[PDB]
């Protein structure tokens, strides 16, 4: 494993809703929201 999930959407910022499909060791975490910024 070296890849977990993806970030979709436009502006990738807290102005337009985005999508996050991060997967982990147990479940998946698909959600639609307006995440700000991470740099990590």
């Amino acid at each position: 494993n070296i890849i977990r999930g993806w970030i979709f959407g436009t502006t990738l910022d807290s102005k337009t809703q985005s999508l996050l499909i991060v997967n982990n060791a147990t479940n998946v975490f698909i959600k639609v929201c307006e995440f700000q910024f991470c740099n990590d």
Partner: antibody, heavy 122, light 108 residues
Framework: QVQLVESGGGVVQPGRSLRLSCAAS????????MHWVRQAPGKGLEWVAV????????YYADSVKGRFTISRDNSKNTLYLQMNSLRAEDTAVYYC???????????????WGQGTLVTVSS | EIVMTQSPATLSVSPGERATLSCRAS??????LAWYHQKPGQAPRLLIY???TRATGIPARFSGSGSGTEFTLTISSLQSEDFAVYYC??????????FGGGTKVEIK
């Protein structure tokens, strides 16, 4: 590093045709759209045309609609612009600029070439 | 067609202090606008996109604000590479594509 190099400009007579090229390297050229932007001396920037990442979708400015043709060759990482029926006001410097998808399909010109000169006179 | 207008066409200010520029749109364009920096003889460079977000490699002194039809571009401290011409370009109405007349910032 990215590098957009233009060629094909020069001196032309009114009513004639010219072809310009803009070679691209240093980035995945096949997945990005490219534009042509011209700037008349003493004037601001003027949009001209745009071609999508494959070539089915193209748009033109109302001032050069019908006379200008834009095309690309993915197998060579080259961009062309075929100009026909050149008039006096088409004297300017043309720029080829890569497009970076934002909000819409393409709205930001993030990298620009040095530009070439096109002048028409008798 | 939506027409950009730049009120401060002429701007002379000595290095060190702040400079303020404005661009006006005939119709509401939300925050969909970009600023470009162009010295004489060179290709324009991207400075601000989204009317409030700086581009990569842009020093923090460059900033902007405004939404709708009124926008401003603010440079807190001008340096030796900042005296040039700035253009405002809208991209809300995608098909037309329009640019401002541009402002020339020079040394006082």
């Amino acid at each position: 590093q990215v590098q957009l190099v233009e060629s094909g400009g020069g001196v032309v007579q009114p009513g004639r045709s010219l072809r310009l090229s803009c070679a691209a390297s240093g980035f995945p050229f096949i997945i990005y759209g490219m534009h042509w932007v011209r700037q008349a001396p003493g004037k601001g920037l003027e949009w001209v045309a745009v071609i999508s990442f494959d070539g089915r979708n193209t748009y033109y400015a109302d001032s050069v609609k019908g006379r200008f043709t834009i095309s690309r060759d993915n197998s060579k990482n080259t961009l062309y612009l075929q100009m026909n029926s050149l008039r006096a006001e088409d004297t300017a410097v043309y720029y080829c600029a890569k497009a970076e998808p934002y909000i819409s399909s393409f709205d930001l010109f993030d990298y620009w070439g040095q530009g070439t000169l096109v002048t028409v006179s008798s | 067609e939506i027409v950009m207008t730049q009120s401060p066409a002429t701007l002379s200010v000595s290095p060190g202090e702040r400079a303020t520029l404005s661009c006006r749109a005939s119709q509401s364009i939300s925050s969909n606008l970009a600023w470009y920096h162009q010295k004489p003889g060179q290709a324009p460079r991207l400075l601000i996109y989204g009317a409030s977000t700086r581009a990569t490699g842009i020093p923090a002194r460059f900033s902007g604000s405004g939404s709708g039809t009124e926008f401003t571009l603010t440079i807190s401290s001008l340096q030796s590479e900042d005296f040039a011409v700035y253009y405002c370009q809208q991209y809300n109405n995608w098909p037309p594509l329009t640019f401002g007349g541009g402002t020339k910032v020079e040394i006082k």
